[PDB]
Amino acid sequence: AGSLTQLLATGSMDAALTQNATRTFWKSSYQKHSLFALESINQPFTTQVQFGAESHITVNRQGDLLSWMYLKIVLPGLKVQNQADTVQPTQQSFASLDNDVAAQADVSHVLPYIEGAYTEASLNTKEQLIAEAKNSYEAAKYNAAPLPVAAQMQSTEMPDFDYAYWTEAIGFHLIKRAEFKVGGATIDTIWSELLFAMEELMGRAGRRLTETIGRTLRRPTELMKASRQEQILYVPLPWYFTKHPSLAFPLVAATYHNIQLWVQWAQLNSCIIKSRSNLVVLHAERNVPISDDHLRASLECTYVHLEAAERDALTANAGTQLIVQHQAHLQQVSSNNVTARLNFNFPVLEFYYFLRRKANKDAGDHFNFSGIGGRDPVVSAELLFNNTARVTQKPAVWWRAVQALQFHSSAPLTNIYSYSFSLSPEDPITPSGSANFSRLDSVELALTLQDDFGAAHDANSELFVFARSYNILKFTNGLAGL
Amino acid sequence: AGSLTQLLATGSMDAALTQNATRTFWKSSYQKHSLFALESINQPFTTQVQFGAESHITVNRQGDLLSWMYLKIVLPGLKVQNQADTVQPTQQSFASLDNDVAAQADVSHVLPYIEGAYTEASLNTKEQLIAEAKNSYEAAKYNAAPLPVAAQMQSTEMPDFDYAYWTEAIGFHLIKRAEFKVGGATIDTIWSELLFAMEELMGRAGRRLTETIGRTLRRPTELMKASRQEQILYVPLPWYFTKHPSLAFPLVAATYHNIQLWVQWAQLNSCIIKSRSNLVVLHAERNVPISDDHLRASLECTYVHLEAAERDALTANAGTQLIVQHQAHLQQVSSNNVTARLNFNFPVLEFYYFLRRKANKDAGDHFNFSGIGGRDPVVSAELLFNNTARVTQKPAVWWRAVQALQFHSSAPLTNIYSYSFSLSPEDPITPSGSANFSRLDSVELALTLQDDFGAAHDANSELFVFARSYNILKFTNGLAGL
Amino acid sequence: AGSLTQLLATGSMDAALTQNATRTFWKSSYQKHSLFALESINQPFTTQVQFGAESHITVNRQGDLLSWMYLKIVLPGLKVQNQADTVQPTQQSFASLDNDVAAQADVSHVLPYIEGAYTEASLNTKEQLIAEAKNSYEAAKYNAAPLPVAAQMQSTEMPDFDYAYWTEAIGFHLIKRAEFKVGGATIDTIWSELLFAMEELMGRAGRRLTETIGRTLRRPTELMKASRQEQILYVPLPWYFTKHPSLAFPLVAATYHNIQLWVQWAQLNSCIIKSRSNLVVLHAERNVPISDDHLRASLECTYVHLEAAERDALTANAGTQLIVQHQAHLQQVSSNNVTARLNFNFPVLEFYYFLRRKANKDAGDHFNFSGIGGRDPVVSAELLFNNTARVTQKPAVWWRAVQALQFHSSAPLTNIYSYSFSLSPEDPITPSGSANFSRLDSVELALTLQDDFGAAHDANSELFVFARSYNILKFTNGLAGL
Amino acid sequence: PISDDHLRASLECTYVHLEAAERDALTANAGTQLIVQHQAHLQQVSSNNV
Secondary structure (H helix, E strand, O other): OHHHHHHHOOOHHHHHHHOOOOOOOOOOOOOOOOOEEEEEEEEEOOOOOOOOOEEEEEOOOOOOEEEEEEEEEEEOOEEEEEHHHOOOOOOOOOEEHHHOHHHHHHHHHHHHHOOOOOOOOOHHHHHHHHHHHHHHHHHHHHOOOOOOHHHHOOOOOOOOOOOEEEOOOHHHHOEEEEEEEEOOEEEEEEEHHHHHHHHHHHOOOOOOOHHHHOOOOOOHHHHHHHHOOOEEEEEEOOOHHHOOHHHOEEHHHHOOOOEEEEEEEOOHHHOEEEOOOOEEEEEOOOOOEOOHHHOEEEEEEEEEEEOHHHHHHHHHOOOEEEEEEEEEEEEEEOOOEEEEEOOOOOEEEEEEEEEEOHHHHHOOOOOOOOOHHHOOOEEEEEEEEOOEEEEEEEEHHHHHHHHHHHHOOOOOOOOOEEEEOOOOOOOOOOOOOOEEHHHOOOEEEEEEEOOOOOOHHHOOEEEEEEEEEEEEEEEEOOEEEO | OHHHHHHHOOOHHHHHHHOOOOOOOOOOOOOOOOOEEEEEEEEEOOOOOOOOOEEEEEOOOOOOEEEEEEEEEEEOOEEEEEHHHOOOOOOOOOEEHHHOHHHHHHHHHHHHHOOOOOOOOOHHHHHHHHHHHHHHHHHHHHOOOOOOHHHHOOOOOOOOOOOEEEOOOHHHHOEEEEEEEEOOEEEEEEEHHHHHHHHHHHOOOOOOOHHHHOOOOOOHHHHHHHHOOOEEEEEEOOOHHHOOHHHOEEHHHHOOOOEEEEEEEOOHHHOEEEOOOOEEEEEOOOOOEOOHHHOEEEEEEEEEEEOHHHHHHHHHOOOEEEEEEEEEEEEEEOOOEEEEEOOOOOEEEEEEEEEEOHHHHHOOOOOOOOOHHHOOOEEEEEEEEOOEEEEEEEEHHHHHHHHHHHHOOOOOOOOOEEEEOOOOOOOOOOOOOOEEHHHOOOEEEEEEEOOOOOOHHHOOEEEEEEEEEEEEEEEEOOEEEO | OHHHHHHHOOOHHHHHHHOOOOOOOOOOOOOOOOOEEEEEEEEEOOOOOOOOOEEEEEOOOOOOEEEEEEEEEEEOOEEEEEHHHOOOOOOOOOEEHHHOHHHHHHHHHHHHHOOOOOOOOOHHHHHHHHHHHHHHHHHHHHOOOOOOHHHHOOOOOOOOOOOEEEOOOHHHHOEEEEEEEEOOEEEEEEEHHHHHHHHHHHOOOOOOOHHHHOOOOOOHHHHHHHHOOOEEEEEEOOOHHHOOHHHOEEHHHHOOOOEEEEEEEOOHHHOEEEOOOOEEEEEOOOOOEOOHHHOEEEEEEEEEEEOHHHHHHHHHOOOEEEEEEEEEEEEEEOOOEEEEEOOOOOEEEEEEEEEEOHHHHHOOOOOOOOOHHHOOOEEEEEEEEOOEEEEEEEEHHHHHHHHHHHHOOOOOOOOOEEEEOOOOOOOOOOOOOOEEHHHOOOEEEEEEEOOOOOOHHHOOEEEEEEEEEEEEEEEEOOEEEO | OOOHHHOOOOOOOOOOOOOHHHHHHHHHOOOOOOOOOOOOOOOOOOOOOO
16 A cells, blocks of 8 residues: 555656656666677787887787777896896996985985984984984974874884895886877877876776786885796776777778887886895896896787678768877976976866975885875965966865865875866766866966975975876878877 | 678577667767866855854855865864873863773673672783673673684784874764755755765775775774874765756855855864873864864865856756755664654655664764674664564664665675665666655664663663655745755 | 856867757756665575575565565584584584695695605704795796795784684585576576676675675684674675666566576585584584584565556566576696687677686685685686687786776686676676677687696696676566576 | 897798789779688697597
8 A cells, every 4th residue: 555655646746757757677678789899919019128218019900999908018027146146247226225215315304303413323223313303393394293203113024135126016117108109190198107197096996907017005025026026017008099989999990090009118227126235136037137128018909890881881980089188297396386387288177296206216116206204295286277266275185185086986095186177087988077278378286395395305306297188089081180 | 700700690689789779889979068167165164163063154156056065174183291281281071091981881791791709800810801701791692602812802002102183084073963054944964973874885995085084994093193283174065966967056046045054063072082081182283272162164165167058048947956855863772672763754765774882972982883892783673664564674784784785885894774765876866766754654663782782881872863865956036945 | 258268269179079968067857767666575495405405495476576686694603622522523524724735735746846854854844845845846837036935934823722614705605506497497597606706806896795705805813703603694696687677577577487596505514614623513502513404594585566557567568688697617627738618608798717726625715716826827828719719828917807907897806817708798788799609619718727737636626617698588478488 | 148139030022013904904803812721729638539
């Protein structure tokens, strides 16, 4: 009686929701689709792959569309030997944990707050004086309550043996820059720092790229274990056509253009960290000093094979694809107040920004976007259009956590900040907002950074700003162009 | 030959799926949208913000729609001083870890199972006798196999120094109640306990509110670290209009109504936990005793600016929005059998329920919904409509884990139970089932709780029941009303 | 001036995106739906439930559709007693940690690399010699750099007391096979190993089945704690009709067919691991030796009640549902080169494969798909259609991580490999690609495994291959059939 | 020491140049060629019966 009465208890308001219902929950409807197949094919680079060099590949035409694209990287296992035991000790310098430049830079900021005879003190007494000076510095700069000295003395249990390892997220770090080219024109460009920021914000829970890029979430002991043997990494290249099947790049519609991936590789000296400064780093299998020719890479492409009728239709009329392109503003930081002039073009969906200390970069911690003592490097930021506040001054947590909560699949674990003009900037096919930067005379991101950011040992810290913008790729008569 | 043969190998069954295909995977189609912009604007309260008080803000009209809404809370850093060293030691009492009322309440239930001279025993001997009595209690009540005494002796390594900290998820705890008002009518009401339950069930992986609300997942050492300095929290207010862009509140259509947020704040005594009972809690920067006027809050609103044509269309005909409203049944618990009479109205989508021990509340652990010794407080529950079982007796795990698995984005880490009448209760725009409680003469939730729940030291434990219900908000001639 | 200028700054390209816009972000539209209700009902098996037996249930007709289906399993708490203290010590043998067959099998592969007097060595000296021989084995087989001996000596801190526990993910392990039958015909079949693989790949972040199936992510101390008391598990049965509301099984349309669930239960000897070989395992409450009749299970079904008009429409014309069926190829492995001949039928969406060592199975670690020393058991795999490479030789990481990244909600934590022909194999209602195996004369999965896989102590290791295939379920005149 | 980069290879192809009339005829109607393709079955052997 009650359940039937609920179906009868309808009024004029229910008519807007349920009158002439076009859907039922109790019967499945499905759509028929055209026939297609997927094939994954690995392809060698057209030029030699080496650390610090640029390499390119011309993408083969082994199907009708191009869907997924992965850079397959093979890194050798690492071993170490004392320089005294080596017949040829001359190698490039690597970052070493016995010379922690990041810890030395952090100590340099607290030196003015050390009370007593620091120079003559025992090692254990120096560690105590540094921890007390950190409390005095943080009280003076941040009105922070002092932490117990014992809580600041975190011994990272480092192993009592010699090692070397590939840096955190080495699969991204290796790709300093990649360019997707069609007919000799650059269609899009991605950077190592952008790839990491995109994975932090858009990386879905349970599908994080951890193993696929050599990322351990800053657990040095896991990087050491992984680096003792050969590593095979599959780094996704997040081009517009890899984001949705309807955006797959129509190879058949671009028949008269070569499709190329160009990759600028990281220098070998930046890719490795060692336990001690006096160690030589060896290729674990070959027992020779590690060299720039030990980088191996290939391109793994997923091709789509279409039925003849769909292939012929796509060849006759591929039309236009909405694309997202990436733009970059890279700036050196030497002061706590920084203004970035964002000379980006087109309808910008969103931008990302973050800072890297010089000391973190020099320590080989390339994706450590933290400030001094691991703090947030940004105090506040403001966004100006034509000297008018588009976003008034907001604290770092608003740009990092509130923007990520509103617009992104994930909140960043590092100090990555974002701002979206789009309601859904991760939707590759549905435009949901933008600001046209080609119609603004000035776009300025004004930053107030933490105290002493870009001073002394951190002179030439880096500001990264990346923007995502809409453009249109047009296919006509076997040619493709922006 | 094989791939072409697959496209030809079609029969009468494939016609229902692929005949006259209206979609292709090999060409992107996109829709054009109207022009809009988003602006985030921070606004002060109209009344003073203080602990234990009620404050309100009249929301400004700085755009055409209202989308996201965050309560921006600023909490001072905490320090502690001995009461003997303080010129004015008189402060409100705070929960203290040297007087663990929750642990004392748990010990009180096992006192009848202590064999031997408990009163005269050494401290280490008392801890042994309590762990043995816990085994005897759990064997007698639950037929549990005894745990090794050493496995029950979990020392939480508490630091050997003085501290105070803000309670777990302080950003939610501060909001005892918030009311969204339009034209003086309450449109919706949210509670601290509901906000926490909603984040447990609907909080997406990689987008949990942890830092934004001061939540550490019960790691006291992280709460201590965070509480030594100023904290800025961004607490999302999950109103119907914050859930989807098409539900954004049409400011232009409600021109003759004031929009107000009212917030009832938590008492300061409930917000802080200290290491010892004899400590005074100080504002870390000001070096004065912490007081009710040290709470600071503002409202951060995201406005939408529309193109004139869409703004004019929305002003002429905003029509009706489907809304979700929240209802609450709050009850004291003094027995292991509890019947809650759910006097909720309208088409209910779902309800949540959970229990809080008096001892957990008094210990300042406001979101600890566990039973005695951290067990599940519910043994079983039944749902009755007009004295007829709508859901027959089911064990706690069915209401907690099976209902969350079927209908929610996440399973709760705490003892939160749910039940959905909707197939998709997290979809804000598509009704997918409900029960109309305004047409039921009685709705009863019958609970069988764990043994001794609501007895002795837990007299006046709390039952929370929250329901989500459909209603319609109508916009007409510049006015808005339910 | 700028925001209005952006709305005016439109060209011929914007017309494809925004001309005649059919959607606005500033007004919600909702659809009305038909009236329905959900009811969860628990039902006993029609036959006795026992370990190692087959049991069936005839599903009741308590609503119009069948939606969710959970196997509710109740396992007793475990206790242990010395065999010498037991009046009837005769019980089935259980795996024991004092006889670690998996560790003994791993040691057997490194015996040829032990230098010195192993047989006469002290226990601590034998552990050192085994760790050194592991380095020599891994250097010889994999060109691995040696790990420090201290880093290989992981003591799992096992408790110094007697225990027994239910094996990891016991809720899946108990279900050796389940069959969904309609009118005496098997519509679909699921296996324990498939259920685990499906949860690894398709298990969403924050909705993992951990507690619901007794899974701890290989933390033996948590399995021990859980196994001391009665456990209630809710194992989801992932049939086609549980995946989407529009696929709910139409009970009213199948009126003349009995609906049955058949379950083949695991043997009791495979379900329990004990600290020592000389222990008897007891039912914790009853204080009797654990026996095959101590398994309890029931079926929890969610019924849908429809409004009379929708019920009558569905009875008159339920039509056809697209279904996914599961197929299995199970093979013994006795060599490092393995070819699996996949005699699957119908349009296959995707397949999963993985290996289990005999030693891992015999140790009671049923979901440990790792190789020797916890390594990846697959070096490479190739997929052939009619002796032509459909997927050329690819390394294990491509089949495990790249395929999961492209097509699945999660990456597997275990050595589960997949390959999809579908762009969205987790979409239950939208076909997005397949390969028709009923039109291929041969489908071969060729595997190169790690060295010594399937040799000596691992003779009769297992290869599992599972495929997901499309079929059609037809409803006509109160009958249902494939 | 001999290394993997010491392999050198190039492709030597014989091209046919046709008279314009035959080239034009072939461009207009090359039709179909009968081809022979190669297929492979590769198997490991661990027993005297295979």
